[PDB]
Ligand SMILES: O=C(O)CN(CCN(CC(=O)O)CC(=O)O)CC(=O)O
């Protein structure tokens with residue numbers, strides 16, 4: 001069947017509530033649900049469910065003109081009432097969306113007619129349109145499928161306007177999607193997509209080698225990277241590696257001994273041989289990261305000075321800070337206290353473990369004792385939210401989140417970044433400036449504020465950037481060239497064209 005494919009995902013796609021997070025998978029929410037405006041790789045948006053829009057001079061009131069020809073997959077019309085009901089349903093759960101500042105800025109949403117939708121904002125929020133473009137939460141389910149006139153407590157059928165329809169889901173086995181034959185836009189070439197639930201990366205590679213699946217698409221965790229490199233040379237297969245999409249880093253706890261000392265954080269940022277780490281654990285497949293955001297990220301080409309691998313310098317910094325080696329020991333001490341740092345990661349994630357072992361080795365060579373704390377996912381996320389870590393693996397979010405949304409979220413205390421930053425004298429100023437940068441319409445001031453925030457974060461050595469990672473593809477050749485989505489968390493199945 002040349003227009004049916006089988007792929008894999010580590011978990012089910014979830015219930016496909018458009019307005020909720022885990023266990024809903026973003027790429028799948030994006031398959032069914034659509035936005036008012038669609039994000040493009042150049043950073044702009046184009047008309048989508050909204051054909052056009054205007055705003056007020058003060059930038060607080062926006063009026064969208066909607067398409068008039070869009071139906072939900074169940075035949076019900078998409079109109080301004082439906083869109084307004086969705087916004088209400090999202091904002092009824094406002095607390096859950098704190099990380100996204102548009103959810104705090106929207107003050108009112110109302111359908112002025114079937115085709116006119118008015119959105120009012122607290123302030124002149126510059127990332128407005130890009131945040132409407134996101135996979136979640138501002139996309140649209142048929143209001144008939146609300147439960148008790150809400151979505152925050154669940155939905156009935158996951159009815160969107162999008163090019164794919166969920167056919168069926170079987171927990172821990174598979175999810176099947178079919179093409180929407182009444183889609184308002186271009187019809188996908190592919191008719192059916194089956195997602196086999198395959199949690200282990202090795203098991204995913206095996207499934208591809210046996211012919212059980214036709215396509216694997218995902219980030220650096222998709223399959224073992226040595227196997228990837230092998231497949232890349234195998235003439236029976238097709239593989240791809242995108243340009244980098246986001247940063248993988250450690251976050252260092254500025255509020256916990258001994259990472260509360262700037263000098264210790266500086267030393268750590270000279271201690272890791274990142275090129276080696278990438279060649280060893282990532283099989284040469286990713287790029288070295290010197291800064292939180294790659295220089296290609298909007299607002300982030302700042303000429304920030306890299307801390308290159310330099311164990312001599314790391315040891316000098318620590319000696320100067322009073323962290324010195326006792327007679328016959330390899331671990332430094334200050335005030336009888338050992339230089340001991342806990343590194344938390346997801347313990348069943350083989351790649352993270354491999355990286356953690358490398359980081360531990362490199363840091364031992366400069367007299368820091370890194371203890372590896374590998375735990376289940378829920379325990380790691382809990383550590384991130386409450387700052388119970390020394391160092392922790394973390395990542396940025398990709399386009400169109402990076403940098404404005406990721407920075408916005410640094411203000412939210414129940415996220416790793418806030419927690420890592422909590423010990424900085426200038427954290428309140430950073431948070432103030434993050435608030436300002438998002439509202440400011442003076443473009444000169446906006447660049448200054450991004451420079452200031454990112455520069456403080458860099459100079460304070462809050463992070464240990466490791467790698468700018470890429471999306472990876474393995475496919476049967478008959479599927480052809482597999483496109484990448486502008487939005488880093490989306491999978492553009494509708495663009496596959498054998
Ligand atoms: O996952 C969440 O609950 C919310 N996200 C907000 C950022 N997300 C977008 C999302 O979940 O909608 C980025 C991402 O998950 O890549 C927090 C996080 O991932 O750290």
Ligand SMILES: [Fe+3]
Nearest residue numbers: 021022026397
């Ligand atoms: Fe998220």
